[PDB]
Design a protein around this ligand. Structure first.
Ligand SMILES: CCCCC/C=C\C=C\CCCCCCCO
Ligand SMILES: [Mg+2]
Ligand SMILES: [Mg+2]
Ligand SMILES: [Mg+2]
Length: 141
């Protein structure tokens, strides 16, 4: 659900600032991670793929093939209030998007394509949160 997705986003997003230098993700590309969910943000830059890699690796959320670690992602989602209702669905969506971009050889570009797929399928499945919702949860943990 959208509230669980806003807790995952708010928490995950905390690692954005420490990942900027190494990914090249200028503040003019993405200022706050929460804006990932805006209608006016295009999830397209290779730099943001590189940043998502950096962020993920902080929480062990990707495996050594630079794809989602399913078990660690399940446990991470379940660590939020009401996480059990999202954990299976979100792992399924990400992994279906992963399958669509398996032929992309550049890991950064691949990850940003997967992320744009995941945003669109989240919107489609009615689990994409509003930016206001992520902001409402930003001070937690
Ligand atoms: C992965 C943490 C989830 C945070 C939710 C909001 C936005 C981020 C979506 C990241 C897309 C999934 C990246 C890993 C799949 C690429 O192989
Ligand atoms: Mg770099
Ligand atoms: Mg709107
Ligand atoms: Mg690792």
């Amino acid at each position: 659900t959208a509230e669980v997705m806003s807790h995952v986003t708010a928490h995950f997003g905390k690692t954005l600032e420490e990942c900027r230098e190494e990914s090249g993700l200028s503040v003019d590309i993405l200022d706050e991670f929460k804006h990932f969910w805006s209608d006016d943000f295009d999830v397209v830059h290779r730099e943001l793929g590189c940043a998502i890699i950096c962020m993920s690796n902080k929480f062990s959320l990707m495996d050594d093939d630079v794809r989602m670690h399913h078990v660690n992602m399940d446990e991470y989602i379940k660590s939020f209030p009401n996480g059990q209702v999202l954990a299976e669905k979100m792992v399924k969506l990400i992994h279906n998007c992963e399958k669509q971009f398996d032929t992309e050889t550049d890991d950064c570009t691949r990850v940003v394509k997967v992320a744009a797929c995941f945003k669109e399928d989240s919107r489609k499945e009615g689990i994409a949160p509003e930016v206001a919702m992520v902001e409402a949860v930003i001070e937690k943990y």
